[PDB]
Design a protein around this nucleic acid. Structure first.
Ligand SMILES: COc1cc([C@@H]2c3cc4c(cc3[C@@H](O[C@@H]3O[C@@H]5CO[C@@H](C)O[C@H]5[C@H](O)[C@H]3O)[C@H]3COC(=O)[C@H]23)OCO4)cc(OC)c1O
Ligand SMILES: [Mn+2]
Ligand SMILES: [Mn+2]
Ligand SMILES: [Mn+2]
Ligand code: NA
Ligand code: NA
Lengths: 483, 189, 481, 190
DNA sequence: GTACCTACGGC
DNA sequence: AGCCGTAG
DNA sequence: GTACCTACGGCT
DNA sequence: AGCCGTAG
């Protein structure tokens, strides 16, 4: 190709990379709330049959299969993404069920992938539910040797439930996690009122709900983030002042802000004390244990005001941290800054499409089965002449054509008759075939009723969401305090 | 590398020597940080029986253990300066874990013998079901191996010093033939 | 409770020593493999990684092997698989690798996520008949899987590819050999159990290194084959040639086995730099994929090039010894073995494998013939068969009535009930008859082999001859007297 | 890290900058060691447009390239001192390989501009798509990308210095908004 | 068994 | 005295 | 990801 | 600042 202009080369190579990071790496899809690596892990777990009822599988086997079949990148990117999905301090609704050392709030890494084991959580079954019912579009994998989903059915609003953080090119994303009961109630309210306001939606969705619990100071930052997609949210640790004996007091921290490394926050407090940037601290201990939960103790000097010290710690350490909301997600394969209503609208549209496609798949499948039963019915009613037709036929092709012409059967019906085992000729089979057919005809009309009325279809979406809310919905962890 | 405990009263303090950071993390999360310290090793440690003093003293892992114990070594050993009255060997539940344990015991016998004589050296007993301690959850490592209410620790005892001297020289020394003869004589296939 | 340091040391050390000896560092005399290599190859077979199928990503192969059979670090598995793919390490490579699999200069292979692999055609011969009850399977490390204790190994792999391993209290160093020579040696032994080492050496001249080169004398080879221990002098293939203007050069085209070419060159450069060798004006590695190994040592005008070459043999790895120490697992125990012993244990494994396969094949053919006898009755009385089935309300009733009416076994009645309507056509009816007639002839052929130990032994000979004709190649290493 | 060539005549010598050690080994085996040198790069390299001079000069990958080229940098650059008259960028035929190429070109434009102007900077064209350079055998890397008889090298040309200055500042600089505006204007989502 | 770089955006 | 190759 | 630390025996 | 999390 001889020559190449440096300006043209730079613009093309940089845009190629920028675009790939944006649409195929760092940003989540608005529909299922996933980035490609996360979607490939979950799809991989489903294809490998790693359901919650089955025993755990070695992480290296899960990762190797995902890397080879769908994700042509380093194993650490795959494994570390699977590890985060298994951490109850990272995911508001964990997607991976891990066996072994899966890390801590102190930033300790997980054990090597050869030591750990994993499988799906029960809630992940809801992300994958109906994937093999033609509900979502499958695409060719990187080498054309496999097929992978472009998106997951996602039967609960996962983008907002688990949130997302990603550094792309020219942009980034920072979506906080939310309470599943609040989100589904918000989706339900939107389904009954397309013109619902953000303020009205906030009657259901109070604000973010961090897996790490803690506090949020005020509603102004939450409101702005939900109205525009951008806003600053003040997160505070759960801290109390209590006596420790001899007229002395201490600050006890039991919950810390989301994504704050506990060990690093403690070291920052120690640094402030060491450099005399804070007055009144006599001791600093991490009394955290599996029994006690998070327990950070800050001993206060006798007669020093413990509330003044606590307020100084909020100003000078991650004990108070802001969450800079920047809700960027892939909407029709393009990055977009979206508000709360926008995110819920795209999610509800995905659900309507999924439930409609599933109902269409089930109808085709039932119509195909009814057609086969009609063929089997004929075969059983004329079994002596069916056997004679087959026996007098030298080849399969001859048996097929003779059955089709003699008994007014289709290619599919003749094939089903030829595939029929001798045990299907037992006395009560003709009745089973009749009962199944009558039940199928009823099932077909039930499906046709759903597809003919958009309200019936929409009520089914509502009902299935309510069920997930009742089964997986939990209490709010983060307290939203009025500032 | 040392993840020390809160307390500075050695009588109630314990130090757990684990194989790597994979077991380290589990151990750090599962422990009682008030009285339990964790020192993750770097797999197979130096065999002091085959190494010269200059190499032993320059070895980072050997140095880390001496620094953590606070007693000093050889003639300069001081039992009153022990930072923990329990030194717990918690290697992975595999044959390589057994080897690391022999290497650790070789180091304590030749450089910190009064630590064994005082009954400060112990052997943790994790379940047989998992090889690497990294395979275990923090709660099961606590309940089965670290919790004083349910754990079964083996206190290392020195009965015969002449027999122990000969055992360490035969098994860990540079003479291959005596080790080969020991294997041949005691091997049960 | 309490634990004596002497008892603790003896038990923990013996546990480790024993495991390294029988389950790590030493090869089995039968298939010539250590556990990690056996698990890789078995893994390749279970994953269907045969030479006709496309290459699979190395990380996927390694992950499966690690999870199912080998509870150790992935580098130990991957690096063992890499070695089996190197034509400079293996005399008969066992792994077919795609991508950077390393070089003679000690360059490592590309990361396991970049490389791909599958079996070589000769590996099919190691795995041939593994699912024909020819070898014993054992429980894996966690009891969730089954793995072979040994591979059928239809060619003598211990001696063909050799072995090196550092254990505890012992080590092993078995050199590779020529496959034509080895099979001819096994054939000679099969016709004479009292054959001498000297007689066996008429077939097996000595080791045959993948790196070719030279061996100086037969005395070291002879001592090694007679006792299992001996020192073998290996020399590079080097020539002296003119380069113009009355000047000469030493050209090295083959180097000794396991010698790193880059490190040997640096040692020559070091000698020149430190003036420990006289007469060298230049040192170049002209090696290329298109020309092969080519190391050039330019000689100073009027300097004696043969004197310089002889000094290089004395002072550099250009001449290297191979210390033979033939230790292998014999009945699960480590043993120093001579050439005859290695061949004897190998031939016994083959007789056992071919006998077991013939017994397996007989049972399977007899089971299939029994089913076909049931199908033939069904076809001969198909109207009565259909009536019996139709008048039965359940599957259990149809089963019992078919067994009763047509003197059929539970297996025969089940096979009739599982029979599809398409099996009633002219072509499908005849297929059942033709398969049965072929099976009867096959059964008698198998019974002939099992009734005569000479026929069985001749079949071992014939199958070995076939492998020799297909995979046997020319000698590479020259044994100079 | 540099696996240099036999010849010391820069006019016939080529240096291949390869993405990773996995690619390095196969290229070292496949090359013509008389005229072809290999310098492997440990993934994503420093963006000199975003970095200050001390960080650039203290960077291991940047130092290795300066040492290998033998020209010096900036005002101290000397074209006559070039150790190779062909500097070949050999990255994977994927998006991350394209990124490493932009990072490499940024470094050459800002510190070794006369090297581009002299026509010494080239872009290797390995078989497009699929897995990386480590996935390739030494013989196929030679035949398709390194063999002068069959390879197709792209010679990097500088046409407009004002346009190139603006391009490097927009794409690689610290101002996110102009880069975001460039993406928005040129992005084709198909 | 271990240590350590780089891009990328936002605050 | 440092390398070979399975292991932590 | 890679080149490092370590055990282990027998050659040099 | 330097950290968040997918990438080389
Ligand atoms: C040295 O050989 C190459 C290295 C690289 C880099 C790299 C570069 C480094 C460096 C480290 C790394 C390393 O990152 C480390 O991965 C570790 C993987 O396990 C987890 C537990 O912890 C990760 C560390 O957090 C991270 O620091 C590599 C992993 O994958 C890469 O792409 C990384 O420290 C110094 O410079 C690229 C290459 O060609 C593409 C190479 O040939
Ligand atoms: Mn271990
Ligand atoms: Mn790539
Ligand atoms: Mn790795
Ligand atoms: Na703060
Ligand atoms: Na390892």
């Amino acid at each position: 190709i001889n020559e190449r202009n440096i300006t043209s080369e730079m613009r093309e190579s940089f845009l190629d990379y920028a675009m790939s990071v944006i649409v195929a790496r760092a940003l989540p899809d608005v529909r299922d709330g996933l980035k490609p690596v996360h979607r490939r892990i979950l799809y991989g777990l489903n294809e490998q049959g790693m359901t919650p009822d089955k025993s755990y599988k070695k992480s290296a086997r899960i990762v190797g299969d995902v890397m080879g079949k769908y994700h042509p990148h380093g194993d650490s990117s795959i494994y570390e993404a699977m590890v985060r999905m298994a951490q109850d301090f990272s995911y508001r609704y964990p997607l991976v069920d891990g066996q072994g050392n899966f890390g801590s709030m102190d930033g300790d890494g997980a054990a090597a992938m050869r030591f750990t084991e994993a499988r799906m959580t029960k809630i992940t079954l809801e992300l994958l539910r109906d994937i093999n019912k033609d509900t979502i579009d499958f695409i060719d994998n990187y080498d054309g040797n496999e097929r992978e989903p472009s998106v997951l059915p996602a039967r609960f609003p996962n983008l907002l439930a688990n949130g997302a953080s990603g550094i792309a090119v020219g942009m980034a994303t920072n979506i906080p996690p939310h309470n599943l009961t609040e989100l589904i109630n918000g989706v339900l309210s939107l389904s009954k009122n397309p013109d619902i306001s953000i303020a009205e939606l906030m009657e259901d969705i109070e604000g973010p709900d961090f897996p790490t619990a803690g506090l949020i100071l005020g509603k102004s930052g939450i409101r702005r983030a939900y109205e525009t997609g951008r806003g600053s949210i003040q997160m505070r640790s759960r801290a109390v002042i209590e006596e420790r004996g001899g007229g002395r007091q201490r600050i006890v921290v039991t919950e810390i802000p989301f994504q704050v490394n506990k060990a690093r926050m403690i070291e920052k407090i120690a640094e402030l004390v060491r450099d005399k940037k804070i007055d009144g601290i006599t001791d600093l201990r991490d009394e955290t244990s599996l029994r006690t939960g998070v327990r950070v103790v800050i001993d206060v000097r006798k007669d020093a005001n413990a509330s003044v010290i606590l307020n100084n710690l909020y100003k000078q350490t991650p004990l108070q941290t802001s969450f800079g909301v920047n809700m960027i997600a892939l909407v029709n394969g393009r990055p977009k800054l979206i508000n709360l209503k926008e995110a819920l609208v795209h999610y509800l549209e995905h659900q309507k499409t999924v439930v409609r496609r599933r109902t269409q798949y089930n109808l085709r499948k039932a119509k195909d089965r009814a057609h086969i039963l009609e063929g089997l019915r004929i075969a059983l009613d004329h079994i002596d002449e069916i056997i004679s037709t087959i026996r007098e036929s030298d080849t399969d092709k001859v048996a097929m054509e003779s059955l089709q012409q003699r008994f007014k059967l289709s290619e599919k019906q003749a094939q089903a008759i030829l595939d029929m085992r001798l045990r299907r000729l037992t006395g009560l089979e003709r009745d089973k075939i009749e009962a199944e057919y009558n039940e199928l005809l009823n099932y077909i009309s039930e499906l046709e009723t759903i597809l003919a009325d958009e309200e019936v279809l929409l009520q089914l979406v509502r009902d299935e969401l309510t069920e997930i809310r009742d089964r997986f919905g939990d209490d709010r962890r983060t307290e939203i305090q009025l500032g | 590398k040392l993840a020390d405990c809160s307390s500075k009263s050695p009588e109630e303090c314990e130090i757990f020597l684990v194989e790597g950071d994979s077991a380290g993390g589990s151990t750090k999360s599962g422990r009682d940080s008030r009285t339990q310290a964790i020192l993750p090793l770097r797999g197979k440690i130096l065999n002091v029986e085959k190494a010269r003093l200059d190499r032993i003293l320059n070895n980072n892992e050997i140095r880390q253990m001496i620094t953590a114990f606070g007693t000093g070594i050889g003639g300069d050993f001081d039992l009153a300066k022990a930072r923990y009255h329990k030194i717990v060997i918690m290697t992975d539940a595999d044959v390589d874990g057994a080897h690391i344990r022999t290497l650790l015991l070789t180091f304590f016998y030749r450089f910190m013998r009064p630590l064994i004589e005082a009954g400060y050296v112990y052997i943790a007993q994790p379940p047989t079901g998992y090889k690497g301690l990294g395979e275990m959850n923090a709660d099961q490592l606590w309940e089965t191996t670290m919790n004083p209410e349910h754990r079964a620790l083996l206190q290392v005892k020195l009965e015969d010093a002449i027999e122990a001297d000969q055992t360490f020289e035969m098994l860990m020394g540079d003479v291959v033939e005596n080790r080969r003869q020991f294997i041949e004589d005691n091997a049960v296939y």
